[PDB]
Amino acid sequence: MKQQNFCVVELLPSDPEYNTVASKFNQTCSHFRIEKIERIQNPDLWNSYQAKKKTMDAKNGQTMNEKQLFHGTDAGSVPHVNRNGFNRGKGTYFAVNANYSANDTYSRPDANGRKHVYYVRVLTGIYTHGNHSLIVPPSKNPQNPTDLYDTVTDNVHHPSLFVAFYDYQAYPEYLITFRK
Numbered sequence: 001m002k003q004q005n006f007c008v009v010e011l012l013p014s015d016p017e018y019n020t021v022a023s024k025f026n027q028t029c030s031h032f033r034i035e036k037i038e039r040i041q042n043p044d045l046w047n048s049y050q051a052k053k054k055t056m057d058a059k060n061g062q063t064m065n066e067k068q069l070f071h072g073t074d075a076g077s078v079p080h081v082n083r084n085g086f087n088r089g090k091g092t093y094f095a096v097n098a099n100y101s102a103n104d105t106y107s108r109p110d111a112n113g114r115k116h117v118y119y120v121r122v123l124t125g126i127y128t129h130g131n132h133s134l135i136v137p138p139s140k141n142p143q144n145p146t147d148l149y150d151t152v153t154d155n156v157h158h159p160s161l162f163v164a165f166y167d168y169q170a171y172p173e174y175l176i177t178f179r180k
């Protein structure tokens, strides 16, 4: 099997890519001081994500299957997330707004008070409303319960949080390190 090797490239604050990630982060987290933004380059996890992205784009027609959402995680979970993504209830949570993921429950501050939030490329595809109780995605058609939804959101009209259940559904593209 593919070992899923990766590289972590630190973006300069003068780099246009840093300003774009900073721009989305500061839409809800302007009160947080960004210590650094690093781009995770995992070719195997990327190709695998882009494989599922190809299949989804051909399934969901006109739908924009991809959203860029936030994920707050502990310091210690960063090398695991760099190499594996959010693969392995079965679900991984993703916030539309960065201040949701900036909660110390999710982005637990380390010994130096640094908090970590990934600016993830997720394959939200075709989604419906989900409660806190479900562990598997619901069936689109009950007469064909094999065809399941790609994600589940809190509000279908105004999404704030998403639940990804599938392998290679998310790519941890950016790591935002920040403090209070």
Ligand SMILES: NC(=O)c1cccc(NC(=O)CCC(=O)N2CCN(c3ccc(F)cc3)CC2)c1
Residues within 6 Å of the ligand: 070, 071, 072, 073, 093, 094, 095, 100, 101, 102, 106, 107, 129, 130, 131, 132, 152, 153, 154, 161, 162, 163
């Ligand atoms: N780790 C994160 O950054 C992050 C990003 C978005 C959401 C979350 N985590 C949570 O919301 C966890 C808390 C929690 O357990 N809830 C709040 C909302 N929940 C929910 C579950 C499924 C839905 F369709 C809609 C909402 C499940 C019960 C974490």
